[PDB]
Amino acid sequence: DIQMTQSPSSVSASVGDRVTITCRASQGISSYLAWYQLKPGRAPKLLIYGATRLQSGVPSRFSGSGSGTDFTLTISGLQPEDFATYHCQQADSFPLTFGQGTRLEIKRTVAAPSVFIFPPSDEQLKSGTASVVCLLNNFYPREAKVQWKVDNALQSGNSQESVTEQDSKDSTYSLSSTLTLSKADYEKHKVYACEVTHQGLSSPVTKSFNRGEC
Amino acid sequence: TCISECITPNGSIPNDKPFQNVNKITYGACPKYVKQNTLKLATGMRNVPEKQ
Amino acid sequence: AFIENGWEGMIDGWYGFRHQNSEGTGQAADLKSTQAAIDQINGKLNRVIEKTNEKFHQIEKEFSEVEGRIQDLEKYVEDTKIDLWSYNAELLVALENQHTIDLTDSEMNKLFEKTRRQLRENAEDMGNGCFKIYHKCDNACIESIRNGTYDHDVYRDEALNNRFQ
Amino acid sequence: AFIENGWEGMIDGWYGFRHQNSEGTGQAADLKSTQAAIDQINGKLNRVIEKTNEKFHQIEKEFSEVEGRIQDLEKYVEDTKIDLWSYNAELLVALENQHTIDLTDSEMNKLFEKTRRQLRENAEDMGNGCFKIYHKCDNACIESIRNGTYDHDVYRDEALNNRFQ
Amino acid sequence: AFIENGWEGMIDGWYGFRHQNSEGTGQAADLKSTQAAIDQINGKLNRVIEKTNEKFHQIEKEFSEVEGRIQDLEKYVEDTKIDLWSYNAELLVALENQHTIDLTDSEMNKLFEKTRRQLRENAEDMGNGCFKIYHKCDNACIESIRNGTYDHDVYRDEALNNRFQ
Amino acid sequence: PTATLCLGHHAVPNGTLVKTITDDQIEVTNATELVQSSSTGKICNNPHRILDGIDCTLIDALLGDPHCDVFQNETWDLFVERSKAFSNCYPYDVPDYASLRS
Amino acid sequence: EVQLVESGGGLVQPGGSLRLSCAASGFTFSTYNMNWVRQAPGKGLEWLSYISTSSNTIYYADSVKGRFTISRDNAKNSLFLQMNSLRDEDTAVYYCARDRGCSSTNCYVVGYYFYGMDVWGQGTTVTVSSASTKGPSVFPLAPSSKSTSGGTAALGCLVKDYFPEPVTVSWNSGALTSGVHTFPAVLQSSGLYSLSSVVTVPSSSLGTQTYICNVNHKPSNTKVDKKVE
C-alpha cells in the first residue's frame, strides 16, 4: 500500500511567517491531490483540490503547487485563527490512503516548566487503589521527556498521561502523568519520584515524597 | 520627445499589442480597450515538468 | 500530457531528440519540426497583434456634466462595444491558447508520424514518448531520422531478428 | 462514428470497457478516461454559463410613442447588438458542439493510445473499437489496462506464439 | 503536406485510390470518403452564405450636411458595427479555412484508419501515402477496400509469408 | 544493437498561467500578455503633432481668449486639454458642447 | 444550503449490528456520489467505502473485507451504512462526505472522487464497548508547598472509572474559571475513561479559599462533590 509520507511532523510559526508543508507519494497525483483543514471538534473542509487550484469560499491567503511526487503547501497569509492540522488525500487511485498530518502550532518563547507532584489522599487508599500524579505546567514545545522511578529503579508499561490543547491567550500546555498502582503495591514501595526533562531546564528538577507523608 | 504610434491619457503605450486596459479614449493606431486586464497568449506547449 | 516529461536542458528549440547509445548521451533540437511549428505559431501572432488597429476620429466617452438622453444613448453604445471587444477577447485568445495546445499536439503527432513512417519493422514505442530501437543506432543513425534521411530497407534485416525474438 | 455501436447498459460513466472471457461478461466504466473528459467538458460550461453576466443600467428598448430620429438611432443599435449577440451565439455554441465531438474523439484517441501503448505485441485491433487479445486475460488483466498498470513484458511470450501463428 | 503529391488526373472526386498491379494501372475515386467529406464541407456553407440575411429598416449612413453631435453619434455607431462585422469576417472565414484543412486531414486520417483497420497483417505503409500490399491484389481486391468490404482473415496466410520474410 | 530515441518538447521551470477553453488556469512554457498594463506616463510628440493646451481648451482657442495668443494659425493632430484649464475672460455657454468640439 | 446530517449513533457492544444514516438537503442526492470516511482517535482519516448514483460501482477498503454494507435510496435521499462484525478498533467518529466531481468552481456535470470532497457533515459518536454506564469516582488531591520563591501550590481532582465520555468538570459551579486546564480522557486497563482537571492557585489561599471540584455526569445523573483541601 502506498503511504502518503509527509515532512515534517509539526510546524511552529508565528503570525505572518511562511509555512511549507510537503506531502510526497510514489506515483503521479499532480492533478489528483486534495488538501484538507482538519480541526478538533469541527468538520473538515477542502482547502486545495487537485494540488493546483483553490476551493471556493476559501480566501486567497493559501496557495500551493506541485505535480509528479513533490508538492509544497505554501501559506504566505497565515492568520492566528487558521491554526489547524492539514492532511493530504490521494485520489489516484483506490484505496484512498490518507496522510499522517502536520500539526501547525504558534511559535512561542521556551519557558521553564514548573514541576509538581501529588501524594495519594486518604479517599483513594481506602477504596483499594493508588495513583501518583506528576503535573507539568508552562512548557513549550510539547516534546518533553518524563520518566518514573520507584525506589531508585525505573519502571515502564504502567503509566499514562494527558496533553491539553493550546491556549488562545497564554499559548501554554499542561501535562499530567498518571502512574497505575494498586492497594498492595502502594504498601510494598516507600519512595516515589518523577523525573522531568525539558529543553529549557539546565538541570533535571525532580520531586520525591514518602508513603507516610500523605 | 519619443516615438509612439498610440496615444492614451494615462501614458502612451506601444501598438505591438492587440488589446489594452489603459483608457477607453484613444487616438490613432491604438489597441482596443477591453475590461479583461489579463490575456496570457501562449506561445508554446504546456509546461510539463520533470519527475526527478 | 503520452509524454511523461519534457527536457529542461534543451534550450535551443521547442522540439528535439535525446539519444542514448554506446557513444554517449546528449540532446539535439530537431531543425525540421521546430521550424515548421513556429511558422504556425508566429503566423497566429502577426494577424492579431500587428496591423489590427483602427485610426479614426472617435467621440467623447467620459463626461462630467450629465445632460440626459444624449449622454445616455452613447453610454449604452460605448459600454456595448467595450463588452463586445471583451467578449471577443475571451473568444479569440482563449481559443488561440486552446488551438496552440492542439497545434503542439499535432506537431508532436506529425513528429510521431515522421518517426513512425521510418521505424515500422525497425523499432517500437515505449509508452513515454521514446522509441525502442532494436538495432545498432550510432550518432549518424540519430541524425538520419532527425533530418528525415533514414532508410527502412537498410536496417530491416538487423532489427527484425531481435524484435520478435 | 470507427466505433459501430456504443453501450446502453453502461450508465455509470461516459466511457468504459466490455470484457469477455471464461469468467463471464460484463461492463465496467473507466475511472481514468471518463474523469479526464468531464474536466474538459465542465470547463467549457463554467466560463460560458457562469460569471458572464453584466449588471449595469440599461436604457429603454421598447417605445409606444414614436418621436423620430432619437428613437430611430437607439433602435438601430439595439437591433444590431441583439443580432451581434445572436451571431456570437451561433458562433460559440455551434463551435462548442463541434469541438465536443472532437473532444470525445480525442478522448477516444487517447484511450486508444493508452491501450495501444500496452498492446503492441500482445493484441491487435478488430475494426469495431474492440481489441483482439491473443493471450489469457482474466478480470485482473482487464483492470490492469483500465487503471493503466498493465505490463507489456509479462504477456509478451504468450501472445506472440498465437498472433502470427 | 505525409502525402508527397496528389493526383491531377482524378477529376471525379476529392479523394480516391491509385492502383497498380499486373492488370494495369488507373485511378478510381472513393465513393465513401468523398461523399462523407462534402456533407461536412457543404454543411459549413449553407449556415453561413444562406439564410443569414436581415431584412429591416436601417438608418441613414452617409450624410452630406454636417449637423453635429447627432451625426457624430451614428458615425461612431456605424463605423464600429462595420468593423465588428469585418472582425467577425476575419474570425469566421479564417477559422473556416483553418478547419477545412483540418477536415481534409481528418478525412484522410479516417481513410487511413479505414485502410489501416483492414491491412494490419496484410500490408504496411510506405511513407508517401501509399500502402505496400504483401499479397496478390487484383482489381476486385482494390474495390473491396474501396467499398469497405475487404476481409482480413482471407489474405492473412498469404501476406504474412512475405512481410517479415 | 539496442538504442533509445525519445520524442519530447522543451520544458521551462518558470512559466505562467494562461486562459484557454478546456481549463481555467494552466501553466505553459512561455506566454505573452496581449494587454498593455503599463505605460511610460508621458505623451510622445512623434509621429503625431501633439498640441499642448496648457492655459486654454479647444473652445477657448476658437472664441478668442487672450490666454491662447500663441496658437495663431496653428495646426495639429491631437489636442490635449488639461484638467487645470480655466477661463479668465467673458464667460460663455456652449449648447451641445460635444457637437462643436468634435 | 448544502448540509449533511448523520444519525444512527449510540452505544453498542463488540459484536452487534447498527445502520447509520446520512441525511442530505439542499441538493439533488441522485446526481452526486457518496462515501464513508471515519476518524480514529489518535490516528488520521481512513476511507472505508464508496458508492455511485447508479448503485453498480461499489468499492471497499482493505480493512473492510466485506464486513460493512453501504446502500442508498433516491426516494429518501439518504445512505444505509450497515455495520457488522465490529471490534474495539472500530470505535471512532464516522462521517459521510460528498464528492466534488470536477476541477472547476461549480460542477454542473458530476464526475468522480478525483478532486476531493468539499462537503462534510457534523458526524455522530459511535462507541463500541462492552462496559455499561457507571458513575464517576472522585478522588481529591492534597496540595503542598513546592515553589519557595514563587509561593504557588497546585491542586486538582481525579475522575476515574466512569462511562461514557465526557464529564463536564468545573470549580465552584463555574465561579473559578481562571487557570483551569481540562485534560482529555485516556483508556485504562479495564476499558473505562479517566481524566483530571487542575487550577493554578497561590499558596496564600489554601487554608482560606474553599475549592469544591464539581463533577456532573449527564446520562448517569451522578453528582459527586469532593472538597479539595
Domain ranges (residues) in chain E = 16-164
Q: CB distance F10–C11 less than 8 Å?
A: yes
Neighbours of chain G (3+ CB pairs under 8 A): A, D
Rg (CA), chain G: 24
Distance between CA atoms of residues G190 and G88, nearest Å = 13
Experimental method: cryo-EM
Distance CA E120, CA B8 (A): 64
**Domain residue limits, chain A:** 5-106, 114-210
Q: How far from each other are the two terminal CA atoms of chain G, in whole angstroms?
A: 53
B13 min Cα distance to partner chain F (Å): 5
E69-116 helix and D69-116 helix, angle to the nearest 10 degrees: 20
- Please list the alpha-helical segments (H only) found in C14-146: 33-46, 69-116, 139-146
Facing residue for C59 by CB, picked from E76, E91, E124: E76
* Residues of chain D contacting F21 with CB distance shorter than 8 Å: 43-44, 47, 99
Please choose, from the candidates A130, A114, A117, A136, the residue with its C-alpha nearest in 3D space to the C-alpha of residue A179: A130
User: Are E114 and D2 in contact (CB < 8 Å)?
Assistant: yes
Q: Which three cell numbers stand for residue G202?
A: 497561590
Interface check for E23 against chain C (CB to CB < 8 A): the answer is: no
Rounded to a whole number, what is the distance in Å from the CA of C35 to chain F's nearest CA?
A: 13
How far apart (Å, rounded) are the C-alpha atoms in residues A47 and A23?
Answer: 14
Q: Are strands G10-12 and G124-128 parallel, antiparallel or unpaired?
A: parallel
> Measured between CA atoms, how close is A70 to chain F, in angstroms?
14
Give all strands (DSSP E) within D22-160, no chain letters: 24-28, 123-125, 131-133
Considering the domain delimited by D16-160, tell me its CATH architecture: Alpha-Beta Complex (3.90)
Query: Distance between CA A73 and CA A53 in Å, rounded?
Result: 12
Contact E72 F98 (CB under 8 A): yes
Facing residue for E160 by CB, picked from D124, D125, D164: D164
Alpha carbon A134 to chain centroid, angstroms: 18
**E81: distance to nearest CA of chain D, Å?**
8
Query: Which of B39, B47, B52 would you mutate first to test chain F, the one with the most F CBs within 10 A?
Result: B47
Long-range contact list for D159-163, CB < 8 A, 24+ apart?
Answer: D159/D121, D159/D122, D159/D123, D159/D133, D159/D134, D159/D135, D160/C164, D160/D121, D160/D134, D162/D134, D162/D135, D163/D121, D163/D124, D163/D134
Residue A88 CB partners (closer than 8 Å, separation 6+): A4, A6, A23, A33, A34, A35, A36, A71, A98, A99
Task: Determine contact: C92 vs chain D, CB below 8 A.
Answer: no
**Domains, chain G, ordered by start:** 3-128 (2.60.40.10), 137-228 (2.60.40.10)
- Report the candidate in G133, G155, G160, G148 with the shortest Cα–Cα distance to residue G228: G155
Nearest CA in chain A to G61: A95
Residue G36 makes CB contacts below 8 A (sequence gap 6+) with G47, G48, G49, G50, G68, G70, G79, G81, G94, G95, G96
Q: CB F5 to CB C130 under 8 A?
A: yes
Strand order across the A174-182 sheet: A114-118, A129-137, A174-182, A159-163
* Site from F96, F101, F102 to mutate, E interface, most E CB atoms within 10 angstroms: F102
User: Which of G100, G123, G181 minimises the CB distance to A174?
Assistant: G181
**Phi and psi dihedrals of B3, rounded to 5?**
-120, 125
Provide CB contacts within 8 A for A171, sequence distance 6+: A106, A108, A140
Instruction: Name all chains with 3 or more CB-CB pairs below 8 Å to chain D.
Output: C, E, F, G
Task: Name every chain F residue with its beta carbon within 8 A of the beta carbon of B7.
Answer: 43-44, 48, 50, 78
For residues F34 and B18, the answer to whether their CB atoms sit within 8 Å is yes
Whole-angstrom Cα distance, residue B33 to residue F21?
Answer: 22
Whether chain D has a CB inside 8 Å of the CB on G103: the answer is yes
Q: Does D120 touch chain C (CB under 8 A)?
A: yes
Give the C-alpha separation, G198 to G155, whole Å.
Answer: 6
Sequence letter at residue F32: T
Residues of B in contact with C50 (CB under 8 A): 16
Report DSSP letters for C7-27, one per residue: BSS--S-SEEEEEEETTEEEE
Residues A129 and G149 sit within 8 Å (Cβ to Cβ): no
Residue type (1 letter), G61: A
Structural element, H or E, at residue E27: strand E24-28
Residues of F in contact with E70 (CB under 8 A): 99
Unique residue bearing C-alpha cell 501518583: A132
What is the assigned CATH class of domain E16-164?
alpha beta
Which phi and psi angles does D115 have, rounded to 5°?
-75, -30
> Is G27 an 8 Å CB contact of chain A?
no
CA distances to E35, E111, G26 from E30, rounded to whole Å, are: 8, 10, 58
Taking the CA of residue C86 and the nearest CA in chain D, the distance in Å comes to 11
Beta-sheet strands, E only, within F41-88: 50-53, 78-81
Given a contact cutoff of 8 angstroms between Cβ atoms, the answer to whether G91 and G127 are in contact is yes
Q: How far is CA D117 from CA A144, D114, D148, D149, D150, in A?
A: 56, 5, 10, 12, 10
- The two domains A5-106 and A114-210 share their CATH topology (first three levels equal): yes
B and G touching (3 or more beta-carbon pairs closer than 8 Å)? no
| Helical packing angle, E69-116 and C69-116, nearest 10° | 20
With an 8 Å Cβ cutoff, are G54 and D11 in contact? yes
CA distance D116 to chain F (A): 17
Question: Residues of B near C (CB-CB distance < 8 A)?
Answer: 5-6, 15-19, 24-36, 39-46, 48-51
Other C-beta atoms lying within 10 Å of the C-beta of residue C155: 23
Instruction: State whether residue G6 is helix, strand or coil.
Output: strand
- Nearest CB neighbour to D117, from listed C2, C73, C77: C2
Point out the residue among G56, G102, G114 whose CB comes nearest to the CB of D42.
G102
**Looking at chain B, which subunits does it touch, using at least 3 CB pairs closer than 8 Å as the criterion?**
A, C, F
At a CB cut-off of 8 Å and minimum separation 6, what does A157 contact? Answer: none
C-alpha–C-alpha distance, residues A160 and F14, integer Å: 52
Contact C104 B35 (CB under 8 A): no
First to last CA, chain B: 52
- Is it true that domain A5-106 has CATH number 2.60.40.10? yes
Counted residue by residue, chain B has a size of 52
Residues 12-51 in B contacting A (C-alpha not used; CB under 8 Å): 49-51
Measured in whole angstroms, the distance separating CA A214 from the mean position of its chain's CA atoms is 33
Give the separation between CA G200 and CA G179, rounded to whole angstroms: 5
Of C69, C91, C164, the CB nearest to D92: C91
Closest Cβ–Cβ partner in B39, B47, B50 for F28: B47
- Residue A46's φ and ψ, nearest 5 degrees, are -70, 120
Q: Which residues of chain D are within 8 Å of residue F18 when distances are taken between CB atoms?
A: none
Is residue E51 exposed (0-12), middle (13-18) or buried (19+ Cβ within 10 Å)? exposed
User: How far off is chain A from F8, nearest CA to CA, in Å?
Assistant: 17
Contacts of F96 in chain E (CB under 8 A): 68-69
Q: Are strands C123-125 and E131-133 parallel, antiparallel or unpaired?
A: unpaired
- The answer, for F37 touching chain C at a CB cutoff of 8 Å, is no
**Yes or no: is domain A114-210 CATH 2.102.10.10?**
no
- Residue D93 near chain E (CB below 8 Å): no
Question: Are the beta carbons of D76 and E92 separated by less than 8 Å?
Answer: no
Side chain identity at E21, as an amino acid letter? N
